[PDB]
Protein backbone atom coordinates (compact mmCIF):
# COMPACT_ATOMS: atom_id res chain seq x y z
CA UNK A 1 0.00 0.00 0.00
CA UNK A 2 1.33 3.92 -0.19
CA UNK A 3 1.84 5.71 2.95
CA UNK A 4 1.22 9.26 3.28
CA UNK A 5 3.40 11.49 5.29
CA UNK A 6 2.11 14.56 6.09
CA UNK A 7 3.76 17.51 8.47
CA UNK A 8 4.26 19.28 10.27
CA UNK A 9 1.49 18.37 12.92
CA UNK A 10 0.41 21.84 13.78
CA UNK A 11 1.46 25.45 13.06
CA UNK A 12 0.45 28.60 14.52
CA UNK A 13 0.66 31.82 12.09
CA UNK A 14 -0.48 35.26 12.06
CA UNK A 15 -3.14 36.76 9.90
CA UNK A 16 -1.87 37.67 6.52
CA UNK A 17 1.11 34.99 6.77
CA UNK A 18 2.02 32.42 4.30
CA UNK A 19 1.91 28.77 5.37
CA UNK A 20 2.98 25.72 3.62
CA UNK A 21 1.66 21.97 4.28
CA UNK A 22 3.75 18.92 2.81
CA UNK A 23 2.62 15.52 1.92
CA UNK A 24 5.38 12.90 1.08
CA UNK A 25 3.91 9.40 -0.56
CA UNK A 26 6.09 6.15 0.19
CA UNK A 27 6.20 6.06 -3.70
CA UNK A 28 5.74 8.19 -6.49
CA UNK A 29 1.66 8.90 -7.28
CA UNK A 30 1.81 11.02 -10.47
CA UNK A 31 -0.15 14.32 -9.14
CA UNK A 32 -2.90 11.48 -8.34
CA UNK A 33 -3.32 13.82 -5.17
CA UNK A 34 -6.15 16.40 -3.51
CA UNK A 35 -6.25 18.42 -0.76
CA UNK A 36 -8.89 18.86 2.19
CA UNK A 37 -10.01 21.32 4.61
CA UNK A 38 -12.52 20.61 7.77
CA UNK A 39 -13.45 22.98 9.87
CA UNK A 40 -14.11 22.01 13.44
CA UNK A 41 -17.97 19.91 13.81
CA UNK A 42 -17.81 20.14 9.93
CA UNK A 43 -17.70 17.49 7.23
CA UNK A 44 -14.27 18.03 5.22
CA UNK A 45 -14.45 20.32 1.92
CA UNK A 46 -11.96 19.64 -1.40
CA UNK A 47 -9.83 22.30 -1.73
CA UNK A 48 -7.57 21.19 -4.44
CA UNK A 49 -7.11 18.44 -6.66
CA UNK A 50 -5.00 16.57 -8.97
CA UNK A 51 -2.11 18.12 -7.20
CA UNK A 52 -3.00 21.89 -8.24
CA UNK A 53 -6.40 22.62 -9.91
CA UNK A 54 -8.66 24.80 -7.57
CA UNK A 55 -12.00 23.49 -6.73
CA UNK A 56 -15.02 25.92 -7.56
CA UNK A 57 -15.17 28.69 -5.20
CA UNK A 58 -11.88 28.25 -3.47
CA UNK A 59 -10.42 31.37 -2.71
CA UNK A 60 -7.03 31.55 -4.65
CA UNK A 61 -5.13 31.92 -1.48
CA UNK A 62 -5.14 28.46 -1.38
CA UNK A 63 -2.58 26.88 -3.92
CA UNK A 64 -1.12 23.03 -4.77
CA UNK A 65 1.98 22.37 -5.84
CA UNK A 66 4.41 18.98 -6.54
CA UNK A 67 5.15 16.08 -8.57
CA UNK A 68 6.64 12.30 -7.77
CA UNK A 69 6.48 12.21 -3.86
CA UNK A 70 6.83 15.31 -2.56
CA UNK A 71 3.33 17.47 -2.64
CA UNK A 72 2.24 21.49 -0.81
CA UNK A 73 -0.67 22.84 -0.03
CA UNK A 74 0.39 26.21 0.66
CA UNK A 75 -1.99 29.52 1.84
CA UNK A 76 -0.65 32.22 0.95
CA UNK A 77 -2.39 35.28 3.52
CA UNK A 78 -3.86 33.14 6.26
CA UNK A 79 -7.12 34.19 7.17
CA UNK A 80 -9.23 33.73 11.17
CA UNK A 81 -11.75 31.63 8.45
CA UNK A 82 -8.53 29.24 7.86
CA UNK A 83 -8.58 27.83 11.23
CA UNK A 84 -9.03 23.81 10.63
CA UNK A 85 -7.46 20.79 10.22
CA UNK A 86 -6.16 19.70 6.20
CA UNK A 87 -5.79 16.82 4.96
CA UNK A 88 -4.11 15.21 2.24
CA UNK A 89 -5.28 12.10 0.21
CA UNK A 90 -3.64 10.13 -2.78
CA UNK A 91 -6.13 8.20 -5.33
CA UNK A 92 -3.68 7.06 -7.15
CA UNK A 93 -3.88 3.25 -5.53
CA UNK A 94 -6.18 1.55 -3.97
CA UNK A 95 -6.25 1.23 -0.74
CA UNK A 96 -6.73 5.22 -1.31
CA UNK A 97 -4.88 6.74 1.95
CA UNK A 98 -4.69 10.16 3.94
CA UNK A 99 -2.14 11.86 5.37
CA UNK A 100 -2.15 12.56 9.36
CA UNK A 101 -3.75 15.61 9.38
CA UNK A 102 -2.47 19.47 9.91
CA UNK A 103 -4.06 21.59 12.55
CA UNK A 104 -3.61 25.39 11.47
CA UNK A 105 -3.98 27.75 14.59
CA UNK A 106 -4.08 31.76 14.28
CA UNK A 107 -1.50 33.55 16.30
CA UNK A 108 -3.10 37.37 17.38
CA UNK A 109 -2.66 39.67 20.13
CA UNK A 110 -3.66 39.09 23.77
CA UNK A 111 -7.57 39.51 24.72
CA UNK A 112 -8.66 39.36 27.85
CA UNK A 113 -11.77 37.55 28.60
CA UNK A 114 -15.65 38.66 29.73
CA UNK A 115 -16.70 36.86 32.59
CA UNK A 116 -20.29 36.08 33.23
CA UNK A 117 -22.08 34.31 36.16
CA UNK A 118 -25.14 32.20 35.91
CA UNK A 119 -27.08 31.07 39.25
CA UNK A 120 -28.79 27.47 38.86
CA UNK A 121 -32.46 27.86 37.01
CA UNK A 122 -35.30 27.78 39.13
CA UNK A 123 -36.41 24.74 36.95
CA UNK A 124 -33.42 22.51 37.74
CA UNK A 125 -33.41 23.09 41.50
CA UNK A 126 -37.16 21.30 41.13
CA UNK A 127 -34.83 18.44 40.81
CA UNK A 128 -32.72 18.46 43.51
CA UNK A 129 -29.51 19.52 41.45
CA UNK A 130 -27.64 22.65 40.98
CA UNK A 131 -25.44 23.65 38.44
CA UNK A 132 -23.45 26.77 38.14
CA UNK A 133 -22.06 28.25 35.36
CA UNK A 134 -19.01 30.14 34.56
CA UNK A 135 -18.49 31.95 31.03
CA UNK A 136 -15.05 32.95 29.71
CA UNK A 137 -15.99 35.04 26.21
CA UNK A 138 -13.66 35.69 23.46
CA UNK A 139 -10.37 35.34 25.19
CA UNK A 140 -6.88 34.86 23.76
CA UNK A 141 -4.19 32.97 23.74
CA UNK A 142 -6.07 29.55 25.46
CA UNK A 143 -4.79 29.09 28.99
CA UNK A 144 -6.90 30.51 31.56
CA UNK A 145 -7.38 29.91 35.07
CA UNK A 146 -11.17 29.47 36.32
CA UNK A 147 -11.31 28.77 40.21
CA UNK A 148 -14.84 28.13 42.00
CA UNK A 149 -15.11 29.36 45.33
CA UNK A 150 -18.17 28.50 47.57
CA UNK A 151 -18.49 30.56 50.93
CA UNK A 152 -14.99 31.38 49.91
CA UNK A 153 -13.68 27.82 50.05
CA UNK A 154 -11.82 26.76 46.73
CA UNK A 155 -13.58 23.97 45.41
CA UNK A 156 -11.99 20.86 43.91
CA UNK A 157 -13.25 18.35 41.65
CA UNK A 158 -16.55 19.52 41.33
CA UNK A 159 -16.22 21.32 38.54
CA UNK A 160 -15.57 20.92 34.48
CA UNK A 161 -14.98 23.06 31.54
CA UNK A 162 -15.05 23.01 27.70
CA UNK A 163 -13.21 25.30 25.78
CA UNK A 164 -14.62 26.49 21.89
CA UNK A 165 -12.38 26.08 19.12
CA UNK A 166 -10.59 29.25 17.37
CA UNK A 167 -13.31 31.71 16.05
CA UNK A 168 -13.75 31.82 12.59
CA UNK A 169 -14.05 35.55 12.75
CA UNK A 170 -11.68 37.09 15.54
CA UNK A 171 -9.49 34.14 16.19
CA UNK A 172 -10.61 34.08 20.06
CA UNK A 173 -11.47 31.44 22.69
CA UNK A 174 -14.52 31.08 24.84
CA UNK A 175 -15.04 28.80 27.86
CA UNK A 176 -17.55 27.72 29.73
CA UNK A 177 -17.17 25.52 33.46
CA UNK A 178 -20.24 23.64 34.94
CA UNK A 179 -19.79 23.71 39.21
CA UNK A 180 -22.37 20.67 40.04
CA UNK A 181 -23.54 20.45 43.95
CA UNK A 182 -26.58 18.86 45.20
CA UNK A 183 -29.32 20.87 45.86
CA UNK A 184 -28.88 20.50 49.27
CA UNK A 185 -25.53 21.59 49.27
CA UNK A 186 -26.08 24.43 47.39
CA UNK A 187 -28.60 25.64 49.92
CA UNK A 188 -26.10 25.75 52.43
CA UNK A 189 -24.13 28.44 51.38
CA UNK A 190 -24.37 31.84 50.53
CA UNK A 191 -21.74 33.12 48.09
CA UNK A 192 -21.17 31.30 45.28
CA UNK A 193 -18.31 33.10 42.96
CA UNK A 194 -15.76 32.32 40.11
CA UNK A 195 -12.15 33.25 40.10
CA UNK A 196 -10.93 33.77 36.89
CA UNK A 197 -6.97 34.57 36.17
CA UNK A 198 -5.54 35.52 32.59
CA UNK A 199 -2.50 36.98 30.63
CA UNK A 200 -5.05 39.82 29.48
CA UNK A 201 -5.77 40.60 32.83
CA UNK A 202 -3.96 42.69 35.61
CA UNK A 203 -5.74 41.01 38.43
CA UNK A 204 -8.13 38.33 38.88
CA UNK A 205 -11.60 38.41 38.19
CA UNK A 206 -14.40 37.46 40.12
CA UNK A 207 -17.99 37.52 39.55
CA UNK A 208 -20.07 35.95 42.10
CA UNK A 209 -23.74 36.07 42.99
CA UNK A 210 -25.79 35.27 46.46
CA UNK A 211 -28.11 32.64 46.75
CA UNK A 212 -31.51 34.09 47.03
CA UNK A 213 -30.11 38.01 47.56
CA UNK B 1 -26.17 21.11 -6.14
CA UNK B 2 -25.27 17.51 -5.02
CA UNK B 3 -25.94 16.62 -1.58
CA UNK B 4 -25.47 13.48 0.70
CA UNK B 5 -27.45 12.92 3.40
CA UNK B 6 -26.81 10.27 5.47
CA UNK B 7 -28.97 8.29 8.36
CA UNK B 8 -28.36 5.60 10.50
CA UNK B 9 -27.94 4.87 14.76
CA UNK B 10 -26.36 7.34 16.80
CA UNK B 11 -26.04 4.08 18.89
CA UNK B 12 -24.77 0.52 18.47
CA UNK B 13 -24.24 -2.62 20.63
CA UNK B 14 -20.81 -4.39 20.52
CA UNK B 15 -20.51 -7.76 18.43
CA UNK B 16 -23.30 -6.64 16.13
CA UNK B 17 -23.83 -4.74 12.58
CA UNK B 18 -23.71 -0.96 12.03
CA UNK B 19 -25.60 -0.47 9.05
CA UNK B 20 -25.83 3.30 7.66
CA UNK B 21 -27.44 4.87 4.37
CA UNK B 22 -25.97 7.56 2.13
CA UNK B 23 -29.53 9.09 -0.06
CA UNK B 24 -27.53 11.03 -3.01
CA UNK B 25 -29.56 14.30 -4.73
CA UNK B 26 -29.04 16.27 -7.46
CA UNK B 27 -26.68 13.09 -9.27
CA UNK B 28 -27.32 9.39 -10.30
CA UNK B 29 -25.75 7.23 -8.36
CA UNK B 30 -25.33 5.13 -11.90
CA UNK B 31 -22.28 7.52 -12.41
CA UNK B 32 -18.93 8.06 -10.88
CA UNK B 33 -17.68 6.62 -7.34
CA UNK B 34 -19.26 6.36 -3.95
CA UNK B 35 -17.56 5.99 -0.61
CA UNK B 36 -17.27 5.91 3.19
CA UNK B 37 -14.98 7.71 5.40
CA UNK B 38 -14.66 7.49 8.69
CA UNK B 39 -12.89 9.88 11.67
CA UNK B 40 -12.74 8.19 14.87
CA UNK B 41 -12.61 10.56 18.21
CA UNK B 42 -9.85 12.71 17.90
CA UNK B 43 -8.40 10.94 14.72
CA UNK B 44 -7.90 11.76 11.57
CA UNK B 45 -9.74 10.89 8.42
CA UNK B 46 -9.70 6.88 7.02
CA UNK B 47 -10.69 5.57 3.98
CA UNK B 48 -13.08 2.94 4.25
CA UNK B 49 -14.27 1.98 0.92
CA UNK B 50 -15.80 2.54 -2.54
CA UNK B 51 -18.59 0.76 -5.06
CA UNK B 52 -18.99 1.54 -8.65
CA UNK B 53 -23.01 1.30 -9.34
CA UNK B 54 -22.87 0.15 -12.74
CA UNK B 55 -20.68 -2.83 -12.31
CA UNK B 56 -21.35 -3.14 -8.93
CA UNK B 57 -17.49 -3.08 -7.99
CA UNK B 58 -16.15 -2.90 -4.72
CA UNK B 59 -12.83 -1.91 -3.31
CA UNK B 60 -12.05 -1.99 0.42
CA UNK B 61 -9.43 -0.46 3.13
CA UNK B 62 -7.72 -3.47 4.08
CA UNK B 63 -8.00 -3.30 7.53
CA UNK B 64 -11.61 -3.44 7.87
CA UNK B 65 -12.48 -5.50 4.23
CA UNK B 66 -13.39 -8.82 6.65
CA UNK B 67 -16.37 -6.76 8.30
CA UNK B 68 -17.10 -3.95 5.76
CA UNK B 69 -19.74 -4.10 3.07
CA UNK B 70 -20.76 -1.78 0.93
CA UNK B 71 -24.15 -1.90 -1.56
CA UNK B 72 -26.52 0.33 -3.61
CA UNK B 73 -29.83 0.88 -4.09
CA UNK B 74 -30.51 2.22 -7.95
CA UNK B 75 -34.24 2.45 -7.62
CA UNK B 76 -33.50 5.01 -4.67
CA UNK B 77 -30.46 6.31 -5.58
CA UNK B 78 -28.68 5.44 -1.82
CA UNK B 79 -25.86 3.80 -1.25
CA UNK B 80 -25.19 1.99 2.28
CA UNK B 81 -22.16 0.80 4.49
CA UNK B 82 -22.96 -2.06 6.80
CA UNK B 83 -19.51 -2.95 9.08
CA UNK B 84 -20.42 -6.10 11.54
CA UNK B 85 -19.09 -7.54 14.61
CA UNK B 86 -18.25 -3.99 15.91
CA UNK B 87 -16.30 -2.69 18.75
CA UNK B 88 -15.63 0.58 20.97
CA UNK B 89 -12.63 1.03 18.41
CA UNK B 90 -15.37 1.16 15.67
CA UNK B 91 -16.77 4.63 17.32
CA UNK B 92 -16.74 7.51 14.93
CA UNK B 93 -18.01 9.83 12.84
CA UNK B 94 -19.03 8.33 8.96
CA UNK B 95 -19.02 10.06 5.96
CA UNK B 96 -20.22 9.13 2.66
CA UNK B 97 -18.40 11.41 -0.52
CA UNK B 98 -18.61 10.78 -4.17
CA UNK B 99 -15.58 10.33 -5.87
CA UNK B 100 -15.46 11.89 -8.99
CA UNK B 101 -13.19 10.73 -11.57
CA UNK B 102 -11.88 13.21 -14.96
CA UNK B 103 -9.06 10.53 -16.86
CA UNK B 104 -6.32 10.15 -14.80
CA UNK B 105 -7.17 12.47 -11.84
CA UNK B 106 -10.02 11.03 -9.12
CA UNK B 107 -10.93 12.79 -5.90
CA UNK B 108 -13.87 13.56 -3.82
CA UNK B 109 -15.66 16.37 -4.78
CA UNK B 110 -18.54 16.13 -2.27
CA UNK B 111 -19.52 14.68 1.20
CA UNK B 112 -21.93 14.23 3.34
CA UNK B 113 -22.00 15.53 6.88
CA UNK B 114 -21.09 13.00 8.53
CA UNK B 115 -23.13 10.66 11.65
CA UNK B 116 -21.46 10.00 14.81
CA UNK B 117 -21.84 6.39 15.68
CA UNK B 118 -20.97 5.06 19.56
CA UNK B 119 -20.68 1.31 20.14
CA UNK B 120 -21.94 0.82 23.33
CA UNK B 121 -24.40 -1.42 25.97
CA UNK B 122 -25.53 1.53 27.64
CA UNK B 123 -29.00 3.18 27.18
CA UNK B 124 -30.24 5.96 25.35
CA UNK B 125 -31.08 8.56 27.22
CA UNK B 126 -32.47 12.43 26.13
CA UNK B 127 -31.42 15.59 27.91
CA UNK B 128 -32.94 18.32 30.11
CA UNK B 129 -32.66 22.18 28.61
CA UNK B 130 -31.89 24.65 31.70
CA UNK B 131 -32.25 28.20 30.89
CA UNK B 132 -28.87 30.59 31.81
CA UNK B 133 -31.27 33.45 32.39
CA UNK B 134 -29.81 37.22 31.88
CA UNK B 135 -29.10 39.55 34.52
CA UNK B 136 -26.89 42.22 36.14
CA UNK B 137 -24.60 39.35 36.65
CA UNK B 138 -24.53 38.55 33.05
CA UNK B 139 -24.75 42.02 32.05
CA UNK B 140 -21.37 43.93 30.91
CA UNK B 141 -21.56 47.39 30.17
CA UNK B 142 -24.31 47.35 27.06
CA UNK B 143 -23.83 43.64 26.26
CA UNK B 144 -26.22 40.53 28.00
CA UNK B 145 -25.28 36.83 28.07
CA UNK B 146 -27.54 34.12 28.20
CA UNK B 147 -27.75 30.61 26.93
CA UNK B 148 -29.31 27.30 27.58
CA UNK B 149 -27.57 24.19 29.75
CA UNK B 150 -28.26 20.62 27.96
CA UNK B 151 -27.62 17.91 31.01
CA UNK B 152 -27.67 14.14 31.40
CA UNK B 153 -27.86 12.80 27.63
CA UNK B 154 -26.30 10.10 25.96
CA UNK B 155 -24.79 9.06 23.36
CA UNK B 156 -23.55 12.31 21.37
CA UNK B 157 -24.43 14.39 19.84
CA UNK B 158 -26.81 17.45 20.44
CA UNK B 159 -27.34 20.28 18.55
CA UNK B 160 -28.50 23.56 19.22
CA UNK B 161 -29.45 26.37 17.21
CA UNK B 162 -30.79 29.97 18.50
CA UNK B 163 -34.33 31.49 17.26
CA UNK B 164 -34.33 28.43 14.66
CA UNK B 165 -31.11 29.43 12.78
CA UNK B 166 -32.11 33.33 12.64
CA UNK B 167 -29.13 34.05 15.25
CA UNK B 168 -26.05 32.82 14.93
CA UNK B 169 -23.58 36.22 15.53
CA UNK B 170 -22.36 36.22 19.11
CA UNK B 171 -23.63 32.10 19.61
CA UNK B 172 -21.23 29.77 21.47
CA UNK B 173 -21.84 26.33 21.78
CA UNK B 174 -19.10 24.53 23.78
CA UNK B 175 -17.84 20.90 23.43
CA UNK B 176 -19.84 18.05 25.52
CA UNK B 177 -18.61 17.14 28.67
CA UNK B 178 -18.56 13.66 29.57
CA UNK B 179 -19.79 13.33 33.34
CA UNK B 180 -19.09 11.52 36.32
CA UNK B 181 -22.44 9.97 35.76
CA UNK B 182 -21.35 8.58 32.39
CA UNK B 183 -24.13 10.90 30.73
CA UNK B 184 -22.81 14.04 28.54
CA UNK B 185 -23.60 17.87 29.38
CA UNK B 186 -23.20 20.89 27.35
CA UNK B 187 -24.16 24.30 27.29
CA UNK B 188 -24.72 27.22 24.56
CA UNK B 189 -24.79 31.31 24.90
CA UNK B 190 -25.23 34.08 22.89
CA UNK B 191 -24.61 37.58 23.86
CA UNK B 192 -26.97 40.38 22.78
CA UNK B 193 -27.73 43.90 23.52
CA UNK B 194 -28.41 44.84 26.89
CA UNK B 195 -31.72 46.69 25.66
CA UNK B 196 -32.85 44.13 23.47
CA UNK B 197 -33.81 41.61 26.13
CA UNK B 198 -37.49 43.08 27.03
CA UNK B 199 -38.07 43.78 22.91
CA UNK B 200 -36.38 40.96 21.25
CA UNK B 201 -37.86 37.16 21.89
CA UNK B 202 -34.27 34.25 23.05
CA UNK B 203 -34.96 30.77 22.15
CA UNK B 204 -33.02 27.84 21.73
CA UNK B 205 -33.54 24.89 20.23
CA UNK B 206 -32.36 21.95 20.62
CA UNK B 207 -32.11 17.99 19.22
CA UNK B 208 -31.03 14.93 20.48
CA UNK B 209 -31.64 12.40 17.34
CA UNK B 210 -30.74 9.27 19.00
CA UNK B 211 -33.45 10.03 21.70
CA UNK B 212 -35.82 11.87 19.15
CA UNK B 213 -36.06 14.34 21.23
CA UNK B 214 -36.88 18.08 20.52
CA UNK B 215 -36.76 21.29 22.79
CA UNK B 216 -37.40 25.05 22.61
CA UNK B 217 -36.82 26.71 25.23
CA UNK B 218 -37.34 30.38 25.47
CA UNK B 219 -34.71 32.51 27.81
CA UNK B 220 -35.92 35.66 29.82
CA UNK B 221 -34.19 37.80 32.27
CA UNK B 222 -34.23 37.43 35.63
PR1 LIG C 1 1.46 24.94 17.02
Known amino acids: DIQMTQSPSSLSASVGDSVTVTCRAS??????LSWYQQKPGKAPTLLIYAASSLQTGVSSRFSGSGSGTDYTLTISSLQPEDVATYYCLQDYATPYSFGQGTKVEIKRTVAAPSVFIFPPSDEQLKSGTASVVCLLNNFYPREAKVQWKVDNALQSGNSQESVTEQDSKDSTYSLSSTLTLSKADYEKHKVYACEVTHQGLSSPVTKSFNRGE | QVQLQESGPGLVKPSETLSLTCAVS????????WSWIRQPPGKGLEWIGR????????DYNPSLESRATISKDTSKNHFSLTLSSVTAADTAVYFC??????????????WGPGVLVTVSSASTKGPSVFPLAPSSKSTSGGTAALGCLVKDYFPEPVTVSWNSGALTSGVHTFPAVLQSSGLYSLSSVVTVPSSSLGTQTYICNVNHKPSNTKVDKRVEPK
Open chain 1, 27 to 32: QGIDKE
Open chain 2, 26 to 33: GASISSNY
Open chain 2, 97 to 110: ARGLWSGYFFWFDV
Open chain 2, 51 to 58: IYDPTDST
